[PDB]
Scaffold this active site. Sequence first.
Site, PDB file in Angstrom:
ATOM      1  N   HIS A 171      42.637  42.115  40.146  1.00 19.31           N
ATOM      2  CA  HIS A 171      43.081  40.765  39.818  1.00 19.31           C
ATOM      3  C   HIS A 171      44.599  40.673  39.580  1.00 19.31           C
ATOM      4  O   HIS A 171      45.201  39.613  39.746  1.00 19.31           O
ATOM      5  CB  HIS A 171      42.384  40.242  38.559  1.00 19.31           C
ATOM      6  N   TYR A 218      36.555  35.499  33.787  1.00 20.35           N
ATOM      7  CA  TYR A 218      35.991  34.194  33.433  1.00 20.35           C
ATOM      8  C   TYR A 218      34.827  34.320  32.425  1.00 20.35           C
ATOM      9  O   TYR A 218      34.571  33.427  31.571  1.00 20.35           O
ATOM     10  CB  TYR A 218      35.512  33.496  34.702  1.00 20.35           C
TER      11      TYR A 218
END
Length: 307
Positions: A120, A62
């Site tokens: 992730h 992010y």
Amino acid sequence: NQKFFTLSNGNKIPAVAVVGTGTKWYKAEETDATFSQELTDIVKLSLDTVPGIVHIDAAETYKTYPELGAALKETKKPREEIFITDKFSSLHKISEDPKSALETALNKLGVDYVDLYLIHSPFFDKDLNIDLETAWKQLEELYKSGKAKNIGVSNFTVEDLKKVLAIAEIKPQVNQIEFSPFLQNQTPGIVEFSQKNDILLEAYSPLGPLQKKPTDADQQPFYQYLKELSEKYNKTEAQVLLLWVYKRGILPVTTSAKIERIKQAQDIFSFDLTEEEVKKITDLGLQHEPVRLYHVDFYTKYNSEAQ
């Protein structure tokens, strides 16, 4: 009132994650210009005003560690009343390896540890000089050192989990997958396999059906029933779906920029769904075409097995 899941190591995790740190517009660089005041403000407001242990879902990809760090510094919400999940960016390299990623994150966040650290994706960027095995072993070391209180993975298949289990001293404690009534098996058999092996599933995009709500919703059995339940319980449709995920034994992850939706997500444990209601949401969902919002290029081939 707040409910928790118990991980395989005996540690507790708040059973809904209600603070997400996505820039509504993907954040390409980390500069003063790209710092999102709007995000930092919503995280701070959440930490200040959401009751109980506030579960944050963050991610290296992010590039919003600065915003989370500023909020964590400025809140008087005590550290022990926050559960921070973070994720090593495997798909798109930002750090060389998990150790480097987490060291950087801890400093930017201004914290000594994260509560949960995930890989992730099983699909490593070609530019990464480390493989899945070596990355998992780095997570095992971050667990042993206490920088990550719990460790796990995200978007792993059964085959991916088996690759980790083949080299693991510490079994992964969590597998965060896309899961909703319109995607009840991200990849084949993942839900049943994970639950049978005491690996807690987290469900991201659990509200996928509400995002992709078609304009004929009023005539779609799934949406009609969801509205019926909302009216029965005087809860939002979102709250009903988040609670359904919890009733399936899965931890919903949601990421609203509206403080009242964040509070509503935390407050799913203010009601319950009957066995009949859980089964009916499941069954009406399974009749629907799959809706997959993430890892689309990798897992489209599994859509036929998802429902």
